[PDB]
Curated annotation (Swiss-Prot):
Belongs to the glutaredoxin family. Monothiol subfamily. It comes from the Eukaryota. Present with 11000 molecules/cell in log phase SD medium. Residues 1-99 form the Glutaredoxin domain. This is Monothiol glutaredoxin-3. Monothiol glutaredoxin involved in the biogenesis of iron-sulfur clusters. Binds one iron-sulfur cluster per dimer. The iron-sulfur cluster is bound between subunits, and is complexed by a bound glutathione and a cysteine residue from each subunit. Homodimer. Heterodimer with FRA2. The chain holds residues 152 to 250 of 250 of the full protein. The gene is GRX3. It comes from Saccharomyces cerevisiae (strain ATCC 204508 / S288c). [2Fe-2S] cluster binds at C25.
Amino acid sequence: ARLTKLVNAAPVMLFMKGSPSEPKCGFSRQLVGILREHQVRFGFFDILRDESVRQNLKKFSEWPTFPQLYINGEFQGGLDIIKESLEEDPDFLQHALQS
């Protein structure tokens, strides 16, 4: 419930290390970069803030690492999967927001 409300805090929600302006990992920084470059406006949460949320989100999404991107409450991938998704569909981020 805690996690559902968090992953749905914004239509696009990025779970990352650090914040978008002060990232604390290279993959966090690159995935921020990709969202900005597509003019995507997004919420975020710094999973460094709380081990419980950090570990439980991995259980939640069934994905072992961060960052983790959610769109409309659905898990979309980490960096490498978002990049592959964009290779397939340059308009991936658009398409994933559609209802």
